[PDB]
Symmetry: C3
C-alpha cells in the first residue's frame, strides 16, 4: 500500500543483494536485509566481487569508509553487474565533503546506477548544481535516467518528472548509526523487484520510517535497534 | 555433555585467535565472552604469526576474504600448527566463489582440527544427507572432525556420526549465528575430552541458547536474549 | 566529585563534538553508537588522503590500534600529523601494547607526536612507559605519572578503579561493574568519549576523569540486568537518558 505491497514482494522474491558498504554499518545492514526477507552477501575481493556481482540480484555501493583497494573492487563489481543486467545502487556518503570519494562517485555515475540514495548536500555535489535539493535531484535523475532519493525528515523521491514525498519516522533514528545506510540496502533490494521503480523506492522509504516510528516509542537508542529489526520482521 | 562443555569453557577460558569476516566480528567476540572464553582479533601478518603461537585455538573464517588477509591467515595457520595449537576452518561460500575455494583447498593441506560448514560448502570442499558421505570422507582423509550444520547438525570423525536437533529457524534470520558457532567449535577443540563429542556439544549449546532466545519471537530481540542465554 | 560527571554530560550534548574515529574492526559500530548516545558525532574516515583532510576539520581525533595493519598505520600517521597542524586534540588507545610487537613499535612512534590523552589498562600503560610491574590499575599509577610528565599529556589508566593524571595531580574514579568486561568494546568506547571530552572547554584532566565516571555510572545501571546481551541496549539508553 505500496508499503505492505513492498513487504510482500521482498519476502516473496527474497532478492540476493551484494553489499559493498562501509565498516560501521555492515552488521546492521545484513540484519536489516535478513529481517525484511532478503539475503545479504558481503564480497569484497576484486575477483570474487566481479564474479558475484554478475550472480546477485542487486548491488549496493556505499563509500562511507572508502579506501583505494576497495574502490578497485567496487568499480569491478559495478562493471560486471552492469554487463549482467543487474541493478546497482549508489550511496554517496559524505560526497562533497571529502575529495577522494567525491571524485570516485563522479566516475561511477557514468556506469548508470538504478538508484542514488543520499542527503541534500551529497545530491547537490553529484548533480553539479532535502527540499532545496529537489531541483538538483530531478536534474540528476533526468541526466542519468535513474531514480534519486534525497533523504531527511521528509524523504523525496524522483525520476526527473514525478516527485513523491514520504513523511514519518522519528528523530531518534538519527541518534543510532546506520539507519540511512540500511535504507540504501533496502532501496537496492527494491530495484530488483517487479513494478514501478520510483514507487518501489518511495515504498522502501515508507517501510523504514514505519519501522522506525514503532521502534522509537521505546524512547532510547539502545532499545531502538532490536525493536526496529523486530518491526521489520 | 552440553552442561559439561558449558562448565569447561568457563573454567578454561580459552584464548581464541579469531580471523573472521567483517560482518560477524563483533557478534563472534561477544558470543565467546558470553560463554567465558577470550576472543582476540589479530590481522597484521606478523602480529598474527606471533599471536597464533600463543593462543589456545585459532579460527579461520573466509567470509570476506582479501589477498592481504589470506597471507596473514596462511602465516597464522603455519605458526599455530608448529606450536601444536588446534585450528578450525569455516569455509564460507566455498563452491560459490573461485578465489575462496582455491585458498581453502590449499589450507586443507595443513590439518585443521575441525571444519564447520553448510552442506554446499562441505560438498565443495571435499571435491544435507547429501553432504554426510562427503563429510565422512573428508574427516577420514584429514583425520579431522567435520560438522555439517543446518536445521539438524551432523558431526563426524569419519567413523561415527552424531546428530543434533533443536534450536529455532529464526536463527537463520540473524547474521553470524553460524560464524559464531564456528568460534565456539574452535574454542572447544582446546578443551579436554573427545573432540567429536565436544564439537557436538558445542552445536547443542548454541541450539539450546537459540531455542531460548527465539521465544520472544523477533530477530532484533533474539540477539540480546541469545547472549544472555549463553552467559 | 560526581559534579564534573553530571556537568560533562550536559557539555557533550551542548558542544556535540565531531570525533574522527580511527579504531579497530571489532568495536566500530558500538563506538559510533556510544558517541551518538552521549550527543557527539562520530566519523570513521580511513583513506590516507581523506583522513588527512578530515583530521583538520574534526574537533578531535581517536587513534585505537586494536586491529592494526600496515596500510591503516599510514593513514593514522597522516591523520595525526594534520590534527596536530590544525591544533585539534588527539587521543591514543594502545590496545595490546607490550603483548604484540608491531603495534608496540608504532605506538612509540606516535608518542613523539604529542597526544592530548592516553587511555590504557595497567599492562598497556606499563609497557607504553617502559616500566616493569581488586584494583588492577593502581600498580601502573607510577607509569602513568611518568608518561604524563615526559609528554605533557593526560594519562588515564583504567580498571575496576580508574586513575587519571597529568603527572602531578591524580584523580580516581570507582563504581561501574565487572559485567562491563564481558562485553566487547566498552574500553575502546570509553577512549572515544575521552577523545570527545578533550575538545570541550575547561580543565582537561578533570574532563577525562569525568568521562571515566560517566561511563562507570552508565555501566552500573546497565549491568543490573545481569546479562551481557541486555547490557548493550540498556547501556546506550542510560547514556542517552536526560
Amino acid at each position: 500500500a505500496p508499503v505492505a505491497h513492498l513487504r510482500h514482494l521482498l519476502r516473496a522474491h527474497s532478492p540476493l543483494v551484494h553489499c559493498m558498504t562501509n565498516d560501521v554499518v555492515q552488521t546492521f545492514t545484513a540484519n536489516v536485509l535478513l529481517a525484511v526477507g532478503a539475503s545479504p552477501a558481503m564480497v569484497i575481493d576484486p575477483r570474487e566481487a566481479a564474479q558475484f556481482a554478475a550472480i546477485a540480484d542487486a548491488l549496493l555501493i556505499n563509500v562511507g569508509t572508502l579506501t583505494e583497494d576497495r574502490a578497485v573492487a567496487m568499480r569491478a563489481a559495478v562493471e560486471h553487474a552492469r554487463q549482467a543486467g543487474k541493478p546497482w545502487t549508489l550511496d554517496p556518503v559524505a560526497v562533497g565533503a571529502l575529495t577522494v570519494r567525491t571524485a570516485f562517485c563522479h566516475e561511477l555515475l557514468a556506469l548508470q546506477p538504478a538508484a542514488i540514495r543520499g542527503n541534500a548536500s551529497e545530491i547537490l555535489a553529484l548533480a553539479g548544481m532535502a527540499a532545496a535539493a529537489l531541483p538538483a535531484a530531478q536534474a540528476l535523475a533526468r541526466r542519468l535516467a535513474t531514480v534519486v532519493a534525497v533523504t531527511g525528515e521528509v524523504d523525496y523521491v524522483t525520476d526527473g518528472e514525478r516527485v513523491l514525498s514520504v513523511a514519518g519516522g522519528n528523530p531518534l533514528m538519527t541518534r543510532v548509526v546506520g539507519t540511512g545506510c540500511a535504507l540504501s540496502a533496502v532501496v537496492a533490494a527494491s530495484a530488483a523487484l517487479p513494478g514501478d521503480r520510483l514507487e518501489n523506492v518511495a515504498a522502501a522509504c515508507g517501510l523504514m520510517k514505519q519501522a522506525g516510528e514503532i521502534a522509537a516509542r521505546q524512547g532510547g537508542p539502545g532499545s531502538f535497534i532490536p525493536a526496529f529489526l523486530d518491526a521489520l520482521y
